[PDB]
Ligand binder design. Structure first.
Ligand SMILES: CC[C@H](C)[C@H](N)C(=O)N[C@H](C(=O)O)C(C)C
Ligand SMILES: [Ca+2]
Lengths: 58, 223
């Protein structure tokens, strides 16, 4: 549902390649993206399901 | 000119891949049971791979060993990235050979303009995406503190240094974190953070490993 859910995905400044989920409001689903390990924002989920439960419907 | 080159198979024998189903970070072998990496590389269910070149095919030199323990520095700051260092104890000792070999810790800190090797399976495109199968290497000099602090005002602690080229196009990127910066055989840094990758006036930031040597040796000894 929310407004952090509309925010584009943020990799940030750390250089890990960790696969996370974000809500893609344009698609109406959660998608994967590369999170570099630090300073995550709130559209950043560890599994599709966590993403769907928090955001799905935004 | 692109920065990276393909190191060549098993030429950086202290480089390890951190795997949780896929390569997410690098690290360095410090002895047959301990790996050093970045704190922001902390995950559950780490498998360490040793003896890799192609991280996508099994080339017969590998040792895949699980971690038993992961110790992030007590004073790791998630916000400021200060003390971005972590030790990983292997479930069982590696067998050290010619493709799998550990890197010596420093006796002193390196000066600005020391040229180092930085190695990784991270993204090879500055703006773009392309993760290599084989391991890449980059020679990059240590930068002065004063320039580092000009590149990133307010953000550089005594536990960080900058390395690379103010011009850009040659850096470390996503995928490369936790992996080595080795200068004249000694492990000086850990791949840590930056403003993007390979952008002008923003060289990479690396954990200053010479500050932690007492902490490493004592944490290794008592765990
Ligand atoms: C440090 C390992 C290598 C050199 C990284 N991942 C890389 O390919 N960097 C590119 C370069 O050629 O230096 C850079 C992002 C353009
Ligand atoms: Ca392999």
């Amino acid at each position: 549902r929310p407004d952090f859910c509309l925010e584009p995905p943020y990799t940030g400044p750390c250089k890990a390649r960790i696969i996370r989920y974000f809500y893609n409001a344009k698609a109406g689903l959660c998608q994967t993206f590369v999170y570099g390990g630090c300073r995550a924002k709130r559209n950043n989920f560890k599994s599709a399901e966590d993403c769907m439960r928090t955001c799905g419907g935004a | 000119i692109v920065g990276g080159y393909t190191c060549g198979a098993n030429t950086v024998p202290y480089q390890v891949s951190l795997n949780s189903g896929y390569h997410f970070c690098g690290g360095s072998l410090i002895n047959s049971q301990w790996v050093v990496s970045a704190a922001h590389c902390y995950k559950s269910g780490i498998q360490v791979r040793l003896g890799e070149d192609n991280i996508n095919v099994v080339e017969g030199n590998e040792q895949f060993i699980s971690a038993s323990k992961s110790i992030v520095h007590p004073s790791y700051n998630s916000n400021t990235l200060n003390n971005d260092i972590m030790l990983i104890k292997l479930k069982s000792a590696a067998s050290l050979n010619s493709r799998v070999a550990s890197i010596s810790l420093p006796t002193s800190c390196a000066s600005a303009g020391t040229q180092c090797l930085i190695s990784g399976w991270g993204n090879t495109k500055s703006s773009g995406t392309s993760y290599p199968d084989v391991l890449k290497c980059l020679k990059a000099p240590i930068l002065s503190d004063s320039s580092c602090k000009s590149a990133y005002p307010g953000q550089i602690t005594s536990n960080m240094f900058c390395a690379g080229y103010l011009e850009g196009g040659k850096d470390s990127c996503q995928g490369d974190s936790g992996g080595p910066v080795v200068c004249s055989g000694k492990l000086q840094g850990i791949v840590s953070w930056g403003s993007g990758c390979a952008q002008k006036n923003k060289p990479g930031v690396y954990t200053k490993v010479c500050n932690y040597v007492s902490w490493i040796k004592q944490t290794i000894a008592s765990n």
